[PDB]
Amino acid sequence: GAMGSMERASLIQKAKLAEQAERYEDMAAFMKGAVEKGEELSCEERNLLSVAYKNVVGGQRAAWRVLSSIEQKSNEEGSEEKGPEVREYREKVETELQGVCDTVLGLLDSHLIKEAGDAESRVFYLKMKGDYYRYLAEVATGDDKKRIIDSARSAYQEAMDISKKEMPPTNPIRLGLALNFSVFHYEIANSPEEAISLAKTTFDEAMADLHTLSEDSYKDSTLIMQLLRDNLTLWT
Amino acid sequence: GAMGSMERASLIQKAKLAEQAERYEDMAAFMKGAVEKGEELSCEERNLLSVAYKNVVGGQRAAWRVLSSIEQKSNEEGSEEKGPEVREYREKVETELQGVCDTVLGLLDSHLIKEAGDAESRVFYLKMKGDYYRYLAEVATGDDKKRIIDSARSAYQEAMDISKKEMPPTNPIRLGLALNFSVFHYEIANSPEEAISLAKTTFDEAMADLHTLSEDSYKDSTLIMQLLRDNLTLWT
Amino acid sequence: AGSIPGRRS
Amino acid sequence: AGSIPGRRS
Ligand SMILES: *Cc1ccc(-n2ccnc2)cc1
Ligand SMILES: *Cc1ccc(-n2ccnc2)cc1
Ligand SMILES: [Cl-]
Ligand SMILES: [Cl-]
Numbered sequence: 065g066a067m068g069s070m071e072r073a074s075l076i077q078k079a080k081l082a083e084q085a086e087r088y089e090d091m092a093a094f095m096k097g098a099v100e101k102g103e104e105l106s107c108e109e110r111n112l113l114s115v116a117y118k119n120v121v122g123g124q125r126a127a128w129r130v131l132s133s134i135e136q137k138s139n140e141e142g143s144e145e146k147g148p149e150v151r152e153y154r155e156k157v158e159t160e161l162q163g164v165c166d167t168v169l170g171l172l173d174s175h176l177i178k179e180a181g182d183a184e185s186r187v188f189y190l191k192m193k194g195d196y197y198r199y200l201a202e203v204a205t206g207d208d209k210k211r212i213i214d215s216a217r218s219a220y221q222e223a224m225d226i227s228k229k230e231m232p233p234t235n236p237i238r239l240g241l242a243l244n245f246s247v248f249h250y251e252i253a254n255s256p257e258e259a260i261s262l263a264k265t266t267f268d269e270a271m272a273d274l275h276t277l278s279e280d281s282y283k284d285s286t287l288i289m290q291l292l293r294d295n296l297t298l299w300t
Numbered sequence: 301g302a303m304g305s306m307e308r309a310s311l312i313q314k315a316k317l318a319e320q321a322e323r324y325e326d327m328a329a330f331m332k333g334a335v336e337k338g339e340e341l342s343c344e345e346r347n348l349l350s351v352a353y354k355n356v357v358g359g360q361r362a363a364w365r366v367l368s369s370i371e372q373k374s375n376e377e378g379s380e381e382k383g384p385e386v387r388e389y390r391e392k393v394e395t396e397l398q399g400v401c402d403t404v405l406g407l408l409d410s411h412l413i414k415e416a417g418d419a420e421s422r423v424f425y426l427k428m429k430g431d432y433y434r435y436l437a438e439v440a441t442g443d444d445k446k447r448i449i450d451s452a453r454s455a456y457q458e459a460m461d462i463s464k465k466e467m468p469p470t471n472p473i474r475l476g477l478a479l480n481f482s483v484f485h486y487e488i489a490n491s492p493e494e495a496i497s498l499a500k501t502t503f504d505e506a507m508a509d510l511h512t513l514s515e516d517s518y519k520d521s522t523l524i525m526q527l528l529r530d531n532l533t534l535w536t
Numbered sequence: 537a538g539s540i541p542g543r544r545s
Numbered sequence: 546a547g548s549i550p551g552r553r554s
Contacts, residue, residue, distance in 0.1 A: 078389050081385070084366055085363035115545060126321075127322065149310050149313045156326075243539060247537050288540070294538060351554060354551045483546050487546055524549070530547060
């Protein structure tokens with residue numbers, strides 16, 4: 065890769081600079097280079113990796129949705145033929161999004177996940193794996209769509225099993241995992257009841273564990289609990 | 301170029317889609333392809349070209365400023381040596397910004413400007429030429445900085461001379477040109493008095509011509525007049 | 537339905 | 546000091 069000649073520490077420093085500059089494509093390339101150095105990632109380094117790619121794919125997903133909406137209106141009854149351009153350009157963005165998801169999944173598979181032994185790292189990477197298969201599932205339509213969905217489900221499920229055994233109910237990674245798995249249930253798996261049950265149980269068990277936390281940990285946990293509550297308000 | 305195989309009309313259609321999707325790099329590449337078809341650009345097409353590159357270079361300028369600020373703080377008395385990384389990454393962004401400016405200037409020179417005979421197109425392209433030399437001037441420090449500044453000045457001046465002869469004082473292109481030339485005077489040429497005089501005279505002569513306009517043209521002109529007023533309020 | 541925004545830090 | 550924002554349309 066093009067980052068093979070840069071020091072690991074310099075890649076990390078520049079990823080932090082790119083975040084300050086809101087240059088998320090650069091940030092993702094720097095963190096990909098840092099991963100490819102082959103050493104495990106620290107807690108802060110895992111966050112940098114996640115933030116970088118979440119922003120990149122987030123822009124791609126927002127663009128894909130704009131274009132998919134235009135395409136669907138064009139294929140309505142009474143619409144004028146505009147030619148192949150809207151489909152072509154949606155496919156363009158879709159292919160670029162899939163390429164980014166494949167890149168992240170490749171980093172997790174080679175070899176972040178197999179070297180991650182602590183609950184905090186292993187759950188973090190498995191949550192990421194579920195998320196990026198979820199993003200692939202959002203655009204999937206072919207022979208493999210069901211397999212993509214099950215790959216997301218399987219990664220989320222393994223992360224959940226570990227987090228329930230190894231982490232307190234208020235752990236922010238455990239909470240964010242449950243939040244995203246509930247969104248998977250609602251948006252991808254057509255299981256809104258499973259989504260609601262998971263969000264409620266996650267919220268109630270975190271509520272009952274708040275008394276054990278410092279003021280700073282309380283702030284971290286209650287922030288994500290409010291996202292669970294926001295979804296429950298939208299879903300019920 | 302990679303757009304050589306796409307129809308001109310398809311490039312224009314996709315540039316409009318990219319704007320809706322906020323995919324400004326794509327938008328700029330589509331419009332570069334449309335320019336390279338060799339036909340003159342319509343009023344709407346010139347706007348698409350301008351919007352695309354203004355957004356691309358706008359993100360680069362915002363990032364360059366963030367990084368230049370970090371770099372200047374690092375080179376202060378009492379700061380810890382962080383190594384070459386901040387300078388290296390600022391240079392990275394700077395070089396990419398210069399590449400975009402060179403690309404736009406190349407399109408204007410080959411061959412938009414020489415084929416532009418109407419006042420509305422010629423002033424529009426010369427304003428663009430002044431703007432992109434201004435962006436080069438913002439980052440310039442070497443043997444050529446004075447020549448870059450004079451290239452900006454010369455393009456703006458030719459656009460001003462044409463606009464004063466050929467356009468009413470409320471014309472939005474004439475107003476936006478005067479606005480940006482006044483920013484050039486203030487920010488680049490160290491001539492704040494020239495900047496203030498130009499903004500005031502531009503505002504007063506537009507004010508006196510508003511009575512000739514329709515309600516829609518009045519809205520277009522008064523919007524840019526308010527930007528002139530905002531600057532005058534900041535400068536005086 | 538909001539996932540972890542996860543866009544900062 | 547603001548130039549033409551010119552980022553829309
Ligand atoms: C996936 C994920 C979980 C939790 C956080 N977070 C935000 C603030 N503290 C922890 C981010 C991402
Ligand atoms: C350079 C420039 C001048 C004027 C406009 N404008 C905005 C709205 N109407 C006209 C944009 C760019
Ligand atoms: Cl395309
Ligand atoms: Cl760099």
